[PDB]
């Protein structure tokens, strides 16, 4: 009886082993499914954010035409005023320069212009 | 009171002066070579984080794949253990139980057999 409850015992358990055995080939599937899932979601999310690297770097490139072109231009307009204001500015010294009477209109012009190359130069900035 | 026409005048040509600046084609180059060195920069970096994060796929695939092969054996070794514990568990009771009286040795055996058991079920629990 201490010897019939040892081999109920031993019986007990190994019926249990055999059922919590499974079907070992089942068991393998969902093993084998289970990486293949973990496989696939390491996969999305790597692609996820190699795309999202390649989307920010074009973007910034795309920024940096973009501001570049507008230094391009600003350089441009500010040499373009520049030469209009030093071709006006010095006729107009020459003309008050060489004047009998500076007329009262070259006067202001001289005025204006130099408030002009002031701008011009601080615009240099 | 000609005096302040010639300071105005001096004034107009010292900002002139100031002014002439070019050369604008120097310039443009300066601009066009910053441009060029942060376009590269971008693509330098890009390209380095990039290899980096292909680096760490690689890493997370291997730890995955050794993950998976680790379980796959700690399956395939406990089944066999499995079938070879419940051949021998079996056996072991009926020579117990056909024994008209079981030796001392044989009875160890059942015992140590048992606990084998006891520990085969609770590392099959999960």
Same mark, same amino acid.
């Given at each position: 009886?201490?010897?019939? =409850? ?6 007990? $358990? ?17 093993? $084998?499914?289970?990486?293949? %899932?973990?496989?696939?979601?390491? &996969? ?11 989307? !920010? %770097?074009?973007?910034?490139? $795309? ?7 507008? %230094?391009? &231009?600003? &350089?441009?307009?500010?040499?373009? !005023? ?5 071709? %006006? ?8 320069? !060489?004047? +009998?009477? +500076? +007329? ?9 212009? !130099? $408030? ?6 601080? =615009?240099?900035?």
């Amino acid at each position: 009886s201490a010897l019939q =409850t040892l081999l109920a015992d031993m019986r007990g $358990k190994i019926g249990e082993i055999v059922g919590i055995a499974g079907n070992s080939d089942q068991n393998l599937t969902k093993v $084998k499914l289970q990486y293949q %899932k973990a496989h696939n979601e390491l &996969n999305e999310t790597h692609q996820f954010f190699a795309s999202m690297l390649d989307e !920010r %770097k074009t973007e910034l490139l $795309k920024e940096l035409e973009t501001l570049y072109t507008a %230094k391009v &231009n600003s &350089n441009n307009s500010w040499q373009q !005023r520049s030469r209009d204001l030093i071709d %006006k500015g010095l006729a107009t010294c020459e003309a008050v320069e !060489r004047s +009998p009477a +500076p +007329p009262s209109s070259l006067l202001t012009e001289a005025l204006l212009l !130099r $408030k002009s190359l002031e701008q011009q130069l601080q =615009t240099g900035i």
